[PDB]
């Protein structure tokens, strides 16, 4: 049964009201997709509202990509979305995590010049 793929896809597309309706009907927020990726991992990092709704319903912020070991905070930092990064950190997203190539969230942010994010992460440390 495919409500796990419907929740991940809606999160990936930033479709807040579709995520909300799926969660309300009992779609499990920590169910992985075909690539073993959870909604919080595949979500449109531009949508802090999707992130908060996932977390309100019990999504875990620290789940790692089973290959890359990228966490949600790595992608939020790499794409420069401070709002989503704050929501994730507030919920318990560890900022001291390294991906497969030994990069921290603050590394991804600095390398691309996402200064609002890099400053937030340097201060939170």
């Amino acid at each position, epitope marked *: 049964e495919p409500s796990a793929d419907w929740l991940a896809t809606a999160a990936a597309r930033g479709r807040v009201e579709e995520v909300r309706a799926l969660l309300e009907a009992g779609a499990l*927020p*920590n169910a992985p997709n075909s690539y073993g990726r959870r909604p919080i991992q595949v979500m449109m990092m531009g949508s802090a509202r999707v992130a908060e709704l996932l977390l*309100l319903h019990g*999504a875990e912020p*620290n789940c790692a990509d089973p290959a890359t070991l990228t966490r949600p905070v790595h992608d939020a930092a790499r794409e420069g979305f401070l709002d989503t990064l704050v929501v994730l950190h*507030r*919920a318990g997203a560890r900022l001291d995590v390294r991906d497969a190539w030994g990069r921290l969230p603050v590394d991804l942010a600095e390398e691309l010049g996402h200064r609002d994010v890099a400053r937030y992460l340097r201060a939170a440390a």
Partner: nanobody, 122 residues
Framework: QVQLVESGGGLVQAGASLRLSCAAS??????????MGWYRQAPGKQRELVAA????????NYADSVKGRFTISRDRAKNMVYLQMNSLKPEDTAVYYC?????????????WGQGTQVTVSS
């Protein structure tokens, strides 16, 4: 604002168990989306984070000194954070505080409740 009230402490002998409760009221919204932790301040020592838990309740961080003796948990529906304290040692003697724990690490805040005194005698 979030109002946190702490209970469960008092006097035990070494080897004993306690269960601390932190109950949230007010912006229980803010509480439900927030990582929470149990902090302790021993006499003559700096306040330290001993246990932290994600919003979701399924992911935890512990100080190595309490890891495996203390379990943090939460009841998302009741707006509660618990610390089950097993195998208590005299060095666990402290005032225990619940607060936010962003990133499962220590908050920087001037907003603390009264805490709950835990005294472990030999």
């Amino acid at each position: 604002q979030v109002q946190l009230v702490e209970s469960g402490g008092g006097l035990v002998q070494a080897g004993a168990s306690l269960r601390l409760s932190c109950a949230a009221s007010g912006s229980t919204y803010m509480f439900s989306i927030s990582a929470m932790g149990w902090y302790r301040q021993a006499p003559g020592k700096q306040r330290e984070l001993v246990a932290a838990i994600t919003s979701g309740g399924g992911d935890t961080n512990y100080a190595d000194s309490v890891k495996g003796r203390f379990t943090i948990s939460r009841d998302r529906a009741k707006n509660m954070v618990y610390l089950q304290m097993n195998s208590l040692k005299p060095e666990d003697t402290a005032v225990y505080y619940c607060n936010f724990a962003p990133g499962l690490q220590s908050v920087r805040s001037g907003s603390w409740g009264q805490g709950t005194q835990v005294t472990v005698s030999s």
